[PDB]
Amino acid sequence: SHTVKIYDTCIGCTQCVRACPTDVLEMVPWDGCKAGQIASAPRTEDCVGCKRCETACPTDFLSVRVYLGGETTRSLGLAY
Amino acid sequence: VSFIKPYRQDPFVGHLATPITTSAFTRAYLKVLPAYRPGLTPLSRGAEIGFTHGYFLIGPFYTYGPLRSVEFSLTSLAAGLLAAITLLLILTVGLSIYGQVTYDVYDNALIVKLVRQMVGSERTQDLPQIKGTSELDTVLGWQKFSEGFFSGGLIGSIVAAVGIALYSTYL
Amino acid sequence: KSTIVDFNPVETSFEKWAKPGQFSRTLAKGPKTTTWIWNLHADAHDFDIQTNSLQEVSRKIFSAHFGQLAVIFLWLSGMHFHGAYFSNYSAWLTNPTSTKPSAQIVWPIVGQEVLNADVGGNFQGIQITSGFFQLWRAEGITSEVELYWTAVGGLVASFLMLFAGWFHYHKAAPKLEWFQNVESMLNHHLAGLLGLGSLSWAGHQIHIALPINKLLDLGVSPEEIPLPYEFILNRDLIAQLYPSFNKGLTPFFTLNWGEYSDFLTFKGGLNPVTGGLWLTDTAHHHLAIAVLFIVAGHMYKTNWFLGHSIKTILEAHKGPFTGEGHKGLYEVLTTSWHAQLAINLALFGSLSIIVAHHMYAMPPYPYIAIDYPTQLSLFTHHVWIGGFCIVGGAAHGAIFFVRDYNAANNYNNLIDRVIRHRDAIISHLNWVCIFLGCHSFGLYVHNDTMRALGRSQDLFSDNAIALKPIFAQFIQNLHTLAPGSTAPNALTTVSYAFGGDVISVGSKIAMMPISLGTADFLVHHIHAFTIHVTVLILLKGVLYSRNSRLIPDKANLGFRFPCDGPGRGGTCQVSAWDHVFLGLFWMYNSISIVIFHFSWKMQSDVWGTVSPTGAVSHITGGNFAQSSITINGWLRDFLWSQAAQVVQSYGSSLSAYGLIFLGAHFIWAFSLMFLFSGRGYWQELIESIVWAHNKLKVAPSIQPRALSITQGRAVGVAHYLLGGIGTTWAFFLARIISV
Amino acid sequence: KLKQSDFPKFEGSTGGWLSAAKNEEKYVIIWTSKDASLFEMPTGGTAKMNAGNNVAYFARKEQCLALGSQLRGFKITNYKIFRIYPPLDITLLHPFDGVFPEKVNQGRSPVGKRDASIGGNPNPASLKFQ
Amino acid sequence: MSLDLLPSFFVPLVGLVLPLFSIIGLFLYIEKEN
Amino acid sequence: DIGGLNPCKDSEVFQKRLAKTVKKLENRLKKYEEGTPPQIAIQQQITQTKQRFTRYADSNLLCGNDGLPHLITDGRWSHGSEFLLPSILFLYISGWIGWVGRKYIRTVGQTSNPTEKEIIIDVPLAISIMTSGFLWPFAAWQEFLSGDLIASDETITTSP
Amino acid sequence: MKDFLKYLSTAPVLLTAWLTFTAGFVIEINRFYPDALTFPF
């Protein structure tokens, strides 16, 4: 399964979570930004690696980073 | 009327009930074939399949081989027969290795029920799972299937060679 | 306040000319990177994203059609002007069989005057392969003054079409209901446009082209031929050549149409003097076509209680296997310009290819069959246009599926049912493509390896394992027996290609029976295989344009997008555009093979010279039958052999063909930089170049960005097509002009 | 006509699940609709909702989530996606805590959070032979 | 057995038998389990 | 002489080339009639060929064994009109172009909308700058001295 | 003629005019003094 990391540059704009096609990211409470929220990656087993999450990231060099790793039938997007 | 409907009333299968997949002709024709004919041991299925396959396999090798003859030649017939037999040997090798790497069962249609009843808390894929309930889906069943395919292929190739010689000589 | 048009919808102003990208909501803000410049031209004619109203899109399309027709009229006016002023048409008229048509002279600069060839008739210029001289002769044009007046009329018509486009966008723009009168539009295009054009052309042929060309074939010089208007004012100048005009129009109105058999014939074959179709046959053909199309125009109900409704016709064509049938197709084709473009472009390209075939098969112009460069150029050009138009039709079908397809409006109709089993279609088409390619090409490779191994009796040749195209030979036999048996009123077969005598004009073969052997079997199956693979790519693009097992929401990404990401193992080129890109490549392959087959087969087994005793000697000598069955044969006896004229053209009047040969090779190889590479590399190289510019304080404000992935693919395919087609263009033209 | 009365009125497509969603895992999405709206299947073509309980089975979580995202356009929000293993092993997936992942809910802990930006990542040479 | 019979003895042997046994072994090895 | 070459005025193969070209042109001229424009054009071609060959002969041009003028670009002023003088001319023209482009970029770079003035050129300012490039060698060695030609550390750099 | 002159000031029109003028004076230099292999001086 791929690896997804969140960095404290998160501004809690939720654009990553609402762009994930496989429900990998979610918004959790935080105290490091104005919005009081930070993205989390608790379901990386469903991560497919499409990187839509970091295409919607407005922070300078990203706050969500997807590191491709071992492959799985879920991560390979295999309907068969 | 509509002649295409979801297969077995399941609209989510990747299949359809067309006048070809589920027609009475298709049903009977596939049920008379050796692979699906009822009352056949795996050895018998293999033997019939091998006979038919060697019988029609000697044809192209003898007719279009490297040693053809517009007249009848014993050398051409021998070349075609040997090529067909070696191709059957290659196919039997493929069958043997496929069965070796595919199944780990010696008696099917039971192990599935045993693990659906007496629990299967093991390494799985041998107790649980098990795709298919046919006797062809076992280590023993596939071994006898390959043996029958190989023997029947030899016999059918020889029979077809004899028939070809008779047709070319007496006609 | 008319019910069909809106008056003064858009003000005629130059203000928006000074605001580039005003049409697009995204481009209107102004450029920030160089991507804006490329996006400006890529969205110029995408009127769907510029307005949200079908009416505005329709009006823009209508005015764009007017602009295109004005451009076409300007091009035709230029052609006629060049024929009038910079051509040897008058000299070619007096010696069609010994003077090469030329209509473009080259200025004497930088030594380029060598391009002015010895075309004959005391003229120097570039030999013309568009066949305008033969067309003008068939029109009865015997003077360059008539060409000048046709050019002036073309200029006037081009201005008229420009004014019409301006008028119908800015002064009186038609409403949506006017555009959606498909019944009225079909009635008019079938009766008025097609039928009345055929009728008017039949009238022109009968009254101008029939007498003038008959006098020309009789040997009368163009100077003593009467002016065309005199054939109308004087019923005695035409009644001598065709002694049936003496009865006037009375036989027509008295149903005694047999009297007009003098100039309305049904002969078939070719004119023995000119080698083209009998112009009496052509006039009769156009008359029959006019009547048929006028009749066909009275079919659809427009404004009276009479005719058909296309909605009622389509909705009644259901079936057990097709569910709702054609229900909803009328709404699809009356609310989506892209669907209409798909159908029209596909059928238009197919029509162009059919035209290309029927052109050389039955030469319709005087002294055009013996002008081999003209025949080769016309066939190749029309087949190329047909292939491009077919790929465009597939592209716009995919665009309709992505954009204008409504799932709710197409419940259980034909479109829905096709998408529901797209897998089966694509898988079986894949199997057919593999079968056809394996067979055709592997038979070619088997022939090649048997020849390389010294086993000549193991080939798929005529003197070996033979694959006779018996079905095509049966059809050829049926056509050569048609006159008197199935076409009892015919005097000769439609084309001598099906069989018959060798038709020669001035010792040059015009047409001759095209024998079909095992060599034609293999190349025909190659054609079928290439066509099937192109259809596979385009149909996979159209059917999987909305969704797939990979990307279930591919329609939300649009018609034109590079990918969905490196995930799923990699989702490159999943668009539908990336399928029109690959299909363009495969169309190039297929059309190149088709034109190669045509060129070699014609040069080897049709074209040539006929000895006075009747011995036929061809351009190459019949090497197609035995040497076109191996890839080495195609490489050596066709490519290497017939490329001799291109490579040895330096210093001669054909040197421009060698230069274009080299330049097209250069462009084709240039394409591979865009086709093989990716953006990350070019963007990161532009980074260092921008660093240098910033170091020298010369970095542009418009930030330079590497071409987008889709634009990189588009540039690659455009350069590939240009280079390959130009290489074949120069090769064909130099070879067929030299010999 | 159909196995269950709550299935959407779909005519079946050769784009549904395969042998994989019989021995590895299958996904089911359930929702309640006020109207028998016509919607597009993530696999094939157009299906008709039921004016009530609707249940659909798919081979991938992404297919169920694409269907759910389409449902939001119909003002349908109560859709829930489950994962079914080879036997009836049902696990609720998408509304994991009853609140959509885009809305912050108490009781969620950050997973995969690094207390630094990208520039704070360790050098790969120090993450070797070790 | 002359030295000129060695090509006809070895070339079929190597170029056909060795592929067969090598394919058998490699397929068996890469299709193993744990 | 230089590199084993010989002057083209004494190169027999050069005169053979001239004679062959003239003979081909005259043979082409034979197939036309009277004072017709084709004959006039071919005669002009012959005259231009003769003039070009004569000028190349009397041009301090060295010809090889193929009878074609070879360029001596080692730097000697004897053959200075072959490379050195055209080199100076191009350097002047290209420096002019680069200088006017850089001056326009730096001038409209201090306005409200620098990017707008790059697709829509300020033709008055463009004409003002372009005709001022004749002093580009002097302007360059008056801006380099003042440090206005080179940036120092406001230029951007990648991560490593 | 205020926006037309601004349209003529756009990059494509100006580049086309400048390149047409440039090719023009190059071609005319090569017409009046053709076959110039070296510097005239």
Ligand code: CLA
């Ligand atoms: C008998 C009547 C008639 C005729 C001859 C035509 C002819 C044509 N129509 Mg047309 N049309 C008609 C009725 C007619 N239409 C009606 C009733 C409708 C309403 C449903 C339309 C709606 C329509 C649309 C929406 C479009 C056309 C287009 C075209 C052109 C197709 C391009 C082509 O084949 O090039 C052949 C070209 C020629 C033969 C050149 C000569 C043609 C000239 C211009 C005569 C045109 C006849 C015109 C209708 C007379 C009106 C004059 C005006 C003062 C009232 C062609 C010129 C397409 C086009 O290109 O747009 C411009 C297009 O997009 N038509």
Ligand code: CLA
């Ligand atoms: C009747 C013909 C016709 C019409 C009306 C259209 C119309 C359209 N097409 Mg289309 N198309 C056609 C034929 C046609 N096409 C054909 C034959 C093909 C197959 C190649 C395609 C392939 C195609 C694709 C793949 C796409 C379109 C798109 C579009 C839309 C936007 C076009 C645009 O802005 O381009 C503006 C014009 C240009 C960018 C011009 C580019 C210059 C070309 C590529 C090079 C031409 C070189 C030329 C031959 C000279 C070379 C000589 C050399 C020596 C210099 C528009 C609705 C696009 C879209 O989004 O649709 C919604 C899109 O993605 N079309």
Ligand code: CLA
């Ligand atoms: C080193 C590699 C190698 C070698 C030595 C051979 C050898 C041979 N090939 Mg071959 N081939 C190879 C690679 C090789 N191939 C590859 C890579 C390809 C694909 C590109 C091909 C494709 C190919 C084709 C398409 C054909 C051959 C054929 C042949 C035979 C030559 C024709 C002849 O006179 O025999 C005549 C042959 C016989 C009289 C009978 C030979 C039958 C087998 C080979 C005998 C093996 C005996 C074996 C020990 C039996 C085991 C016991 C069994 C009874 C249980 C010969 C046996 C031809 C042939 O004979 O087809 C069968 C033929 O048509 N080859």
Ligand SMILES: CC1=C(C/C=C(\C)CCC[C@H](C)CCC[C@H](C)CCCC(C)C)C(=O)c2ccccc2C1=O
């Ligand atoms: C070179 C290259 C670039 C860089 C190319 C750029 C930036 C294009 C630059 C075009 C210049 C600026 C304008 C065109 C200049 C030509 C001389 C004009 C064309 C010639 C005319 C005769 C038409 C990409 O962006 C790219 C993207 C994706 C895949 C491959 C590639 C790729 O290979």
Ligand code: SF4
């Ligand atoms: S890849 Fe990016 S987008 Fe796709 S799931 Fe993993 S995180 Fe969400």
Ligand code: SF4
């Ligand atoms: S993407 Fe970066 S910014 Fe947008 S939400 Fe996820 S973390 Fe916060």
Ligand code: SF4
């Ligand atoms: S960039 Fe090229 S490779 Fe990476 S995803 Fe987009 S297309 Fe596939």
